[PDB]
Amino acid sequence: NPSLIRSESWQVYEGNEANLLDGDDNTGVWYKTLNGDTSLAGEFIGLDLGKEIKLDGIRFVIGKNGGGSSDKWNKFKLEYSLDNESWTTIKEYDKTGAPAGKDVIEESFETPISAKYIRLTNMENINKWLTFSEFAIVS
Ligand SMILES: [Ca+2]
Ligand code: NA
């Protein structure tokens, strides 16, 4: 079973990090970001898969309902790794002006991608806290 990896400096403001793996879009977490309420480029959240596996896709739900519904990155990338040291990007996203609330980031790979770690990583400083709801893989 995957476990959560995320930037260590974030504070859990509301929710429980187990909510990010419970298979329910409707349960999430609200993180307070330090550095003057700023998520710096390079910060991240995703999954340690435990072992290298072939992924057919991912389904990550960023944001959450209510409090912190707009507390989301605007530019971020999906990337994977075999060793937690070198990363390879799969997709870059620009969600500036996306609707408030949950946003389903879902990708399918025609040819599986072998990964031990897979995560979303901020590409650009943003002066916001952050909410998330779910991280899942398809394999
Ligand atoms: Ca959840
Ligand atoms: Na919502």
What's the CA-to-centroid distance between 24 and ligand 1, angstroms? 4
What does the CA dihedral 109, 7, 102, 76 come to, rounded to 10 degrees?
-50
- What's 26's DSSP letter? T
Separation of alpha carbons 138 and 118, rounded Å: 12
**Could you tell me the resolution of this structure in angstroms?**
1.5
What's the CA-to-centroid distance between 28 and ligand 2, angstroms? 10
What CATH number does the domain containing 139 carry?
2.60.120.260
- Do the beta carbons of residue 77 and residue 93 sit within 8 Å? yes
Q: Which domain holds residue 49?
A: 1-139
Separation of alpha carbons 47 and 120, rounded Å: 9
Ligand lying closest to the C-alpha of residue 29 = 1
Count of domains observed in the chain: 1
Method for structure elucidation: X-ray
**Tokens for 93?**
């996203």
What's the CA-to-centroid distance between 66 and ligand 1, angstroms? 14
- Which letter, b or e, does each residue of 39-66 get, where b requires 16 or more Cβ atoms within 10 Å of its Cβ? beeebbbbbebeeebebeebebbbbbee
Ligand lying closest to the C-alpha of residue 25 = 1
